Ligand binder design. Structure first.
Ligand SMILES: N[C@@H](Cc1ccccc1)C(=O)O
Ligand SMILES: [K+]
Ligand SMILES: [K+]
Ligand SMILES: [Mg+2]
Ligand SMILES: [Mg+2]
Ligand SMILES: [Mg+2]
Ligand SMILES: [Mg+2]
Ligand SMILES: [Mg+2]
Ligand SMILES: [Mg+2]
Ligand SMILES: [Mg+2]
Ligand SMILES: [Mg+2]
Lengths: 835, 242, 334, 49
RNA sequence: AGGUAGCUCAGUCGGUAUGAGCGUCCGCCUGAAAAGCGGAAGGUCGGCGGUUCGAUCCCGCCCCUG
C-alpha cells in the first residue's frame, strides 16, 4: 500500500511529549482528532493482549529429537529464579543462549487460546515458546520471537518487555502530505491539533551537529538529474557481531519493517522517525569516485535482491568506477550492500527529483519505502541532520567511530535556504472561504503552527511556508491549513440562490420519454457494458471491412480477451439476454440507452496543452476532434413469448413485427415519423430486416436476427433486435392544429391485387394520395394469397373512412374519391381492383 | 382472474435514482450538463490540476486506451465535465452532470468497474464553503428524507482546495450511523485558470457521489453484481418508472 | 422542493393510461339530465346527493358531478355518434360530494388574517372534493389488421386499467366480487388497497346501457385517488443465480372459488422456494364434474444458496397442494 | 406491414401545456400549489379585495 | 491431477467412441399440463503444430480449474 503509514502510539506520544510533558490520549480520541484534521485511520490495532504467565525465557539446551520428518527439538528454558520448564518446539531460528517469550500453562493468548500442559511427541510440553504473530505483536510466524541479547532478564513479565499495552495506528496519507509519512510529521500535526508546544526531533537542539573537518568521499553530480541535495558521512570500525537493541527492533517491527543488521536498522529507523530515506554503503566496497548521472541506452544493474533491471535514459543512478551503486531513490545494488562482513560503512543522505523517482519506480515495478517518500517530496533541509542522527545512532549500537568528515552537495549554485517562495494573502481570506468569522489572529496563529513565518502589513499577510511543505504554494493552500485545524464542523449551511434555470434540454427530456415508453410496453432496461464479448463480430460473420470492427481498444482490460469498446449496443444486450435465459427467464424483452464508441481516421492522441491559460479555440477543436465519435444509441432485444399465456389463451411468441413496433414506440416518443424499408444487414435476417429512415436519413435497423448468427452465438431461436442512432433523429417540437369535422362519415372497403413483393405501405400511400382530403382514415385489415388470386400476387383489403369538413358527405362523392384512390394505386404500384 | 396480457417492464433503478437526483437539482434552478465516456487525459487529469509523474495520478485505477501514446482513457470520474462546462458556458454556472465512470476494480458485492456518478459544480461571485454545505444538505434531505444530515472532514483532490469527504446520516438506515457518501471542495484556482476564469473575481465549489454506492446503502442492496448484470428479477420490483 | 408526490403520481397515471391506448378528456362537472335515473340508482344512493348551481347554462343540468363516469360516457357517446366506435377514454379530475356538514359561512372581516378556526370552518363548509381517476371503453380494444380480427372490449380490460393505475401508484390491489350500479352484477369488481375500498371496475349493466344509448358491452373504471395512500418503496430484491425447477400443478375446486384465492393458498404452502406462480388454464367439462373447474398453474422453484433438487421442489409442491385443500377445498387433478 | 396492435392514446393538450408551464416554473425554483374548484366567496372575492 | 454428446460425467495404452444420467425431440398418458413410463437424435475426445501410411491415444507449445 503505497500511501500507508504504520506507527505505534508510544513512539508518537514520546515525540509529542518532549514539548508537552504528560500528554496522553485514548486511542479512540486520537483516532477522532486525526480524522478531524484530514488523515484517514484505516485501522487501530491494539497489541496482545496476554493474560496469565507470559514470561521471558532463556534456552539452556536443545536436545534435538531425531527420527521424525520435520526438525523437532525439546528445550530447557529458564523462567527466572532458575525454575526450569520443558517445552517442545518446531522452530529452528534460535540457538543456545537466546532470549524467548514462553507461555506457561494457564495463560491465555489472543484470542481465546488458553495454553495447557500437553504430552507432545516423547516428552512433556509444559508451555510453548511464542512467535510474534501468536503474541499479536508482528506478522511473522515462520520463526519464533528471539529478543536481542540483554533485552531483559529471565523472569520479567512478557506484557511489559514486549509493550503489549501499546497500540498501532494504520493511516492512509493523502499524496499532498508526504511530510506525514514519519513520526516527525504526525507528531507535529498532533501538536497543531492540541495547541501544544512542539520540539522538532530534527532540530539541532535535538541532534547536535557532528564535526565537518573535510570532505568524506569524492563526488561529481550531473545537475540535470534533478538531485537537490546529496550528503555522505562514514562510520569506521563497526562490530559485525552486535545486534540492534530491543526498543529499536520492536519499533521497526511495529512499523512493518523487519530488522537485519544494525547498519540497515538505523537507516530504516531514521527514515521512519524523520521522514528522510537513508542508505548504508559498504565503504570498503566502494572503488573510486561516486557519480550521479543519467543511465545510458542499455546500461543494466542488479539490485540488492539479485534481479537485474533494464534502465532508461531518464533513470537517475549513482555509480563509481567499478559498476553502478544504486538506482537513485529506488533501490541499491548488491555491490556496496552492507553485510555481516562489513565494518566500515558510508551513509548517504540524498534528495531525488520526485517526478524522476516516480517514473523509474513505476517503469521497473518496485515501490519501496524510500521511493514512496521521494515520490511525495522529502524535506531537503534535514539531510545532514538525519545523516548525523544516523551515524551517531549506528556507532552507539555497533561500537564504532564516527568519522568527523562530511560531503554535502547542495547544487551547482549551492543553496542555503530551502523555503518555498513567500505567499501574500489577505488576513480575512480564510474567513471568506469558510463563511465563518474566526477570532482575531486565528490565521496567523494556525499558519505559525504548521511552520510558516508570518508577517503582517495592514490587511495583508506574507506567509513563507516551511521547507517540508512544498504543497503550500497559493493562498488557497493556506486556507486549507487554517480551516482544517479549526475544524470543518464550524462551517454553517447556507443554501445559495441559483439563477432561474431553463430546466432539461429537449434531448434530455426525450431520453426520459423513450425510457418510460419502452418500460411501459414491457421492456426491461439494462446498463450495457462497453467491453465487447470476445469474437462477437466473427460470431456475427461480419465482413472484414465492416465499420463495426473498427473499435477503440483498452490496454489494461479486466478480461484480457475483451479489450474492445463497443461500436453497437447489441452484443451487450444479447449478453444480458443469454444471462436471463440461462437462469430460467426465457421470455425476455430488454433495452438500453447508451453511447457507443466509434473511432475514425481522425482519432488520435493530443499532446499536453499548457494549463496555465484557457486553451485556444483551435486547441479545444483539436481535443474534441481527436476523440472517437460517441453518439447516443437506443437498442432492444426480444426472445421467447412476447405475450405470456394465461386464462385468455396460449400467448404469442416474439416475431419480427414486435421489433418494428419497438421502432414505432421510439418514434412516437421522439415525435417523428419513420419509414421502414427492406434491407440486408447482418446480424439481421435478410428477409426479416428493416432499415429505419427519418425523412431520407438512415437511423438504424430492426427485425429478426439471422438464424446462422443465433446458432453460432447460442441465442434463443427467433431472437429479434432493434438499434437506432438517437443522435441522427432530429429533435422536433410540433404544434398540431387538428381539423375535427363533426359531420357524418362514410365507410367503404377496397380490395386491391398487387405483385406479391409490393410493400403494403406503398399501396396505402398510393390510395391516400389519390383519395385526397375527404379521406380521414385508411387501415389495412386483410392480406390474402390464393389460387383465385393467381401466382406471384397478393390481395390487400383496406377499410377507408371518408368525411367532409362542411357537409354530410354523400356516397357518390365518397365513391368518386374512392375511384380516384383506386386509379392512383393503379398508376403507382400496378394495383388491380379485385374481381 | 389475471388480466395482464402485456407485463410491465422496468427502467433501471440506477437510471431512476439519476432521474430523482436530476429533478432535485432542476427544482433548485440548476441545469444538467453532459460529457463523453472516452475522454482526453487533458480533461480527465491535466486541466483538473493533476500532477504528471506523481502518485496522485499514476495510482488512479485508470483504463488507458491504445496506442500507448494516445493520452486517451475511459474517464475515471465525471469531473472532466467541470472543464467542458466552464469552457462552454458563461458565468455564473450551476450544474450537475450524471454519467458513467470507469475504474479498474473487479466486480464483487461492493465494487463495479462501471459505475455512475453525479458531479456538481457552482462557480459564481462570493461562493463559500457554507454554500457548499447548504447544497449538500438540500441534496441529502431530498434523497434521504427530512432527517438527513451531512458532515465534512478534510481530505484531498487535485482539483479542489480545501478538499473534503462527505458523510451522510439518515434514519431507518443500517438504524442510523454516518455512511461515506462522496467528495467535495472549493474549486482549485488552477482549475479556474485553466478555463480562463479569474480566481480573484469568482470562486466555486464542486462535489461528486457514486450512485451505485448510494443505492447500496440507501436500499440495503447486498450484491452490487445485481445492479449491473441485467437480470430482470432485479429491476421489475422497482416498477415501470414512468 | 419540486413537485409533490401526489403531483408526480398524477403525471405517471396519465402517462401510463395514454401509453396503453387511453385518450384523456376534460370532464364537465355538470351532470347530464336525469343520469342517475337512467342508471337505476336507489333514491338514497349517496351519488344523488349533489351540489347544485343556481344559474346553469342548461337549465336541466344544474347538478355538479359526484362521479366522473357520466362525463366520460357523454364523451364516449359523442365519439361513437361521429363514427369513432373503438374508444378508450380516461379522466383525472375532482368530483363534488357535499355532506350534511356542507353549508354557507357568513362574511369574515378582511382587515386581518382570519383565525385558525375560521380557516378550518371555511374548509369544512365546502363539499368534499376528492381527486378521482376514471376510464371507459367500448368497441374493439385491439384493432383488426394483418395480424387478425382484433379483440372486443371485455371486463378484463377494465380490470387491467385498475392494475395500470395501481402500478403507476406503486400500490398493490385486490379485486373482489361486488354488486354496484351501474356495473353488471356478475362482471364487477370492487377495488381494495389493503382493506380500504378505492373504487370499482368491470362491464356496465346491460339495462343501463340500453336506457343510456351506450355501446353494447361498455366497460368502466372509477377509483378515488385520495383513498390510495402514497408509497415510496425501497426494494432490495433477492436475485439467486442457481438453477430453477419448473413444475405445473392442476387443481379442481368449486366453480365459484376465485382463482386468486387458490393461488394465494398455493403460494402460502409452497414457502420461500416458490419464485413465481402463473395461472395458464381454466377448464370445465364432464371429467371435472358439475359445478367444478380445473385450474392449472405453472410453478417456478429456486433456492437462494444451492441447486434445488427435484425432490426438494416436489416437497414444496406437495405442501402447496395440501394448503390448497385445507383452504379452498382444492383436489389434485386425476 | 402495420405493426401497432395496441394503438397509442393521448394525454390532453391542455394538460400537456399545463405540465410544460409547471416544469418551466419548477426549473426556476418555484413550487406548485393547489385549490378546490368549488370555493367560498370569502376567498374568491372578499379576501381578494 | 483433469478438459470425452447441448450440460454433468464413465471409458478408449496408434487403425470399431463401448458409453450413462440430465436436457432436447418423438410416441403413450391428460381436454390440455406437470410428473410418470417407452423410444430416438446427439460425439474435428481443449487449441495450434510435430511424429506416423494413419493421432482422441505418442512429442512440443499454449488456453481453461483445484
Ligand atoms: N471526483 C471525485 C469526487 C469529487 C468531485 C468534485 C469535487 C471533489 C471531489 C471522485 O471521483 O471521488
Ligand atoms: K440504459
Ligand atoms: K492512472
Ligand atoms: Mg492542501
Ligand atoms: Mg358505405
Ligand atoms: Mg383481400
Ligand atoms: Mg374474465
Ligand atoms: Mg420438472
Ligand atoms: Mg423435465
Ligand atoms: Mg386425454
Ligand atoms: Mg437408435
Amino acid at each position: 500500500q503505497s500511501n500507508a503509514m504504520r506507527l505505534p502510539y508510544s513512539w508518537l506520544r514520546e515525540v509529542v511529549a518532549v514539548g508537552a510533558s504528560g500528554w496522553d490520549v485514548t486511542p479512540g480520541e486520537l483516532e477522532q482528532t486525526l480524522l478531524r484534521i484530514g488523515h484517514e485511520v484505516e485501522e487501530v490495532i491494539p497489541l496482545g493482549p496476554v493474560d496469565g504467565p507470559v514470561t521471558v525465557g532463556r534456552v539452556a539446551d536443545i536436545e534435538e529429537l531425531t527420527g521424525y520428518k520435520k526438525p523437532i527439538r525439546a528445550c530447557a528454558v529458564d523462567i527466572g529464579d532458575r525454575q526450569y520448564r520443558e517445552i517442545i518446539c518446531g522452530a529452528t531460528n534460535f540457538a543456545v543462549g537466546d532470549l524467548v517469550v514462553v507461555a506457561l500453562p494457564g495463560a491465555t493468548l489472543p484470542g481465546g487460546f488458553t495454553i495447557s500442559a500437553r504430552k507432545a511427541y516423547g516428552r512433556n510440553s509444559d508451555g510453548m515458546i511464542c512467535s510474534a504473530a501468536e503474541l499479536n505483536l508482528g506478522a511473522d510466524h515462520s520463526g519464533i520471537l528471539v529478543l536481542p541479547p540483554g533485552a531483559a532478564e529471565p523472569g520479567a513479565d512478557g506484557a511489559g518487555v514486549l509493550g503489549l499495552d501499546d497500540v498501532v495506528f494504520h493511516l492512509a496519507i493523502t499524496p499532498d502530505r508526504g511530510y506525514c509519512m514519519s513520526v516527525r510529521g504526525l507528531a507535529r500535526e498532533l501538536a497543531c491539533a492540541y495547541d501544544l508546544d512542539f520540539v522538532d526531533p530534527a532540530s539541532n537542539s535535538r541532534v547536535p551537529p557532528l564535526p565537518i573537518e573535510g570532505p568524506a568521499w569524492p563526488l561529481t553530480v550531473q545537475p540535470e538529474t534533478g538531485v537537490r541535495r546529496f550528503a555522505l558521512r562514514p562510520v569506521i570500525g563497526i562490530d559485525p557481531a552486535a545486534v540492534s537493541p530491543w526498543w529499536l527492533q520492536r519499533r521497526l517491527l511495529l512499523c512493518g519493517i523487519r530488522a537485519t543488521c544494525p547498519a540497515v536498522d538505523v537507516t530504516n529507523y531514521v527514515m521512519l522517525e524523520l521522514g528522510h530515506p537513508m542508505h548504508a554503503h559498504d565503504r570498503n566496497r566502494i572503488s573510486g569516485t561516486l557519480g550521479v548521472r543519467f543511465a545510458r541506452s542499455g546500461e543494466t544493474a542488479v539490485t540488492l535482491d539479485g534481479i537485474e533491471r533494464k534502465l532508461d535514459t531518464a533513470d537517475v543512478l549513482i555509480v563509481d568506477d567499478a559498476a553502478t551503486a544504486a538506482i537513485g531513490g529506488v533501490m541499491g545494488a548488491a555491490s556496496t550492500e552492507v553485510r555481516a562482513d562489513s565494518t566500515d560503512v558510508l551513509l548517504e543522505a540524498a534528495i531525488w527529483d520526485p517526478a524522476a523517482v516516480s517514473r523509474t519506480q513505476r517503469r521497473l515495478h518496485l515501490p519501496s519505502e524510500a521511493a514512496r517518500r521521494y515520490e511525495r517530496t522529502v524535506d531537503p533541509a534535514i539531510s545532514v541532520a538525519a545523516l548525523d542522527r544516523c551515524a551517531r545512532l549506528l556507532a552507539d549500537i555497533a561500537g564504532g567511530e564516527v568519522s568527523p568528515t562530511l560531503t554535502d552537495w547542495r547544487g551547482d549554485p549551492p543553496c542555503d535556504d530551502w523555503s518555498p517562495p513567500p505567499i501574500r494573502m489577505g488576513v480575512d481570506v480564510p474567513d471568506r472561504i469558510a463563511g465563518v468569522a474566526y477570532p482575531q489572529g486565528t490565521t496567523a496563529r494556525r499558519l505559525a503552527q504548521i511552520g510558516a513565518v508570518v508577517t503582517h502589513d495592514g490587511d495583508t499577510l506574507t506567509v513563507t511556508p516551511p521547507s517540508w511543505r512544498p504543497d503550500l504554494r497559493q493562498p488557497a493552500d493556506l486556507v486549507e491549513e487554517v480551516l482544517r485545524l479549526e475544524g470543518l464542523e464550524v462551517i454553517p449551511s447556507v443554501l445559495p440562490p441559483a439563477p432561474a434555470g431553463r430546466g432539461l434540454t429537449a434531448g434530455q427530456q426525450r431520453r426520459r420519454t423513450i425510457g418510460r415508453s419502452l418500460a411501459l410496453s414491457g421492456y426491461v432496461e439494462i446498463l450495457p457494458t462497453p467491453f465487447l464479448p470476445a469474437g462477437v463480430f466473427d460470431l456475427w460473420g461480419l465482413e472484414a471491412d465492416d465499420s463495426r470492427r473498427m473499435t477503440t481498444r483498452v490496454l489494461n482490460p479486466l478480461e484480457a480477451d475483451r479489450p474492445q469498446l463497443a461500436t453497437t449496443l447489441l452484443p451487450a444486450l444479447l449478453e444480458a439476454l443469454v444471462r436471463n435465459v440461462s437462469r430460467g427467464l426465457v421470455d425476455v424483452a430488454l433495452f438500453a440507452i447508451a453511447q457507443v464508441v466509434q473511432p475514425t481516421e481522425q482519432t488520435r492522441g493530443v499532446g499536453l496543452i499548457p494549463v496555465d491559460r484557457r486553451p485556444t479555440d483551435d486547441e479545444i477543436a483539436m481535443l474534441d476532434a481527436s476523440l472517437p465519435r460517441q453518439p447516443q444509441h437506443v437498442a432492444a432485444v426480444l426472445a421467447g413469448l412476447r405475450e405470456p399465456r394465461g386464462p385468455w389463451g396460449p400467448g404469442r411468441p416474439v416475431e419480427a413485427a414486435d421489433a418494428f413496433e419497438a421502432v414505432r414506440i421510439i418514434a412516437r416518443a421522439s415525435r417523428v415519423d419513420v419509414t421502414l424499408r427492406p434491407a440486408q444487414y447482418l446480424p439481421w435476417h435478410p428477409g426479416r430486416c428493416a432499415q429505419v429512415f427519418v425523412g431520407e436519413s438512415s437511423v438504424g435497423h430492426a427485425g429478426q436476427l439471422h438464424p446462422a448468427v443465433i446458432e453460432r452465438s447460442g441465442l434463443p431461436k427467433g431472437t429479434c433486435a432493434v438499434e437506432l442512432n438517437l443522435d441522427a433523429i432530429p429533435c422536433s417540437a410540433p404544434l398540431p392544429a387538428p381539423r375535427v369535422s363533426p359531420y357524418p362519415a362514410v365507410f367503404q372497403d377496397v380490395s386491391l391485387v398487387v405483385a406479391a413483393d409490393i410493400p403494403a405501405q406503398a399501396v396505402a400511400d398510393a390510395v391516400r394520395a389519390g383519395a385526397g382530403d375527404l379521406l380521414e382514415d385508411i387501415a389495412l385489415f386483410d392480406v390474402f394469397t390464393g389460387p383465385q388470386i393467381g401466382e406471384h400476387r397478393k390481395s390487400l383489403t383496406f377499410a377507408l373512412r371518408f368525411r367532409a369538413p362542411d357537409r354530410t358527405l354523400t356516397e357518390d362523392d365518397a365513391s368518386a374519391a374512392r375511384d380516384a384512390a383506386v386509379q392512383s394505386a393503379a398508376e403507382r404500384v400496378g394495383a388491380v381492383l379485385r374481381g | 382472474l389475471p388480466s395482464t396480457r402485456v407485463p410491465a417492464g422496468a427502467r433501471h433503478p440506477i437510471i431512476m435514482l439519476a432521474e430523482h437526483v436530476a429533478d432535485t437539482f432542476i427544482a433548485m434552478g440548476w441545469e444538467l450538463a453532459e460529457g463523453p465516456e472516452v475522454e482526453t487525459e487533458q480533461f480527465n487529469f491535466d486541466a483538473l490540476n493533476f500532477p504528471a509523474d506523481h502518485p496522485a495520478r499514476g495510482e488512479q485505477d485508470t483504463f488507458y486506451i491504445a496506442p500507448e501514446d494516445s493520452r486517451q482513457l475511459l474517464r475515471t470520474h465525471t469531473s472532466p465535465v467541470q472543464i467542458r462546462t466552464l469552457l462552454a458556458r458563461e458565468l455564473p454556472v450551476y450544474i450537475i452532470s450524471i454519467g458513467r465512470t470507469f475504474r479498474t476494480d473487479e466486480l464483487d458485492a461492493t465494487h463495479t468497474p462501471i459505475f455512475h456518478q453525479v458531479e456538481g459544480l457552482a462557480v459564481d461571485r462570493g461562493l463559500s464553503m457554507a454554500h457548499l454545505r447548504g447544497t449538500l444538505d438540500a441534496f441529502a434531505r431530498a434523497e434521504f428524507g427530512p432527517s438527513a444530515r451531512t458532515r465534512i472532514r478534510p481530505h484531498f483532490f487535485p482539483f479542489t482546495e480545501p478538499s473534503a469527504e462527505v458523510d451522510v446520516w439518515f434514519a431507518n438506515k443500517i438504524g442510523a450511523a454516518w455512511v461515506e457518501w462522496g467528495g467535495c471542495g472549493m474549486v482549485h484556482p488552477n482549475v479556474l485558470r485553466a478555463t480562463g476564469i479569474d480566481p480573484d473575481l469568482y470562486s466555486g465549489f464542486a462535489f461528486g457521489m457514486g450512485l451505485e454506492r448510494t443505492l447500496q446503502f440507501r436500499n440495503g442492496i447486498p450484491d452490487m453484481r445485481d445492479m449491473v448484470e441485467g437480470d430482470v428479477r432485479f429491476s421489475l420490483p422497482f416498477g415501470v418508472g414512468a
